[PDB]
């Protein structure tokens, strides 16, 4: 019915709306702007952004396996 639900501690994506077909830059690679290869996508532990292993700067020969992975847009050296 009417729009309500006052209590709620969540949020959706407006850049795409919340769908697979709806291409996004945040939910997926922001560099090239691709929304494929969800297995080779690295998520940031700060802004929560998906980035390909071959779209970094510098790039990545493959997927890392360290403690965590932080996008190049967050890592301030
Ligand atoms: Zn999105
Ligand atoms: Zn990419
Ligand atoms: Zn980040």
Curated annotation (Swiss-Prot):
Cleaved signal peptide residues: none
Mod. after translation: May be autoubiquitinated; which may lead to proteasomal degradation. Phosphorylated. Phosphorylation may be mediated by CDK2.
Zinc finger (PHD-type) residue numbers: 26-77
Subcellular location field: Nucleus; Chromosome
Induction: Up-regulated in proliferating fetal lung fibroblasts and in U-937 myeloid leukemia cells. Down-regulated in these cells by growth arrest and differentiation. In other cell types which cannot leave the cell cycle, such as tumoral HT-1080 and Hep-G2, levels are consistently up-regulated.
Top-rank lineage group of the source organism: Eukaryota
Disease affiliated with this protein: Associated with various cancers. DNA copy number loss is found in multiple kinds of malignancies originating from the brain, breast, stomach, kidney, hematopoietic tissue and lung.
Domain notes: The YDG domain recognizes and binds 5-hydroxymethylcytosine (5hmC).
Subunit structure of this chain's protein: Homodimer; disulfide-linked. Binds methylated CpG containing oligonucleotides. Interacts with H3; the interaction has a preference for the 'Lys-9' trimethylated form of H3 (H3K9me3). Interacts with PCNP. Interacts with HDAC1. Interacts directly with CCNE1; the interaction ubiquitinates CCNE1 and appears independent of CCNE1 phosphorylation. Interacts with CCND1; the interaction ubiquitinates CCND1 and appears independent of CCND1 phosphorylation. Interacts with p53/TP53 and RB1. Interacts with UBE2I. Interacts with ZNF618. Interacts with UHRF1. Interacts with FANCD2. Interacts with ATR.
Function statement: E3 ubiquitin ligase that plays important roles in DNA methylation, histone modifications, cell cycle and DNA repair. Acts as a specific reader for 5-hydroxymethylcytosine (5hmC) and thereby recruits various substrates to these sites to ubiquitinate them. This activity also allows the maintenance of 5mC levels at specific genomic loci and regulates neuron-related gene expression. Participates in cell cycle regulation by ubiquitinating cyclins CCND1 and CCNE1 and thereby inducing G1 arrest. Also ubiquitinates PCNP leading to its degradation by the proteasome.
Protein name listed in UniProt: E3 ubiquitin-protein ligase UHRF2
Residue range from the parent sequence: 326 to 395 of 802
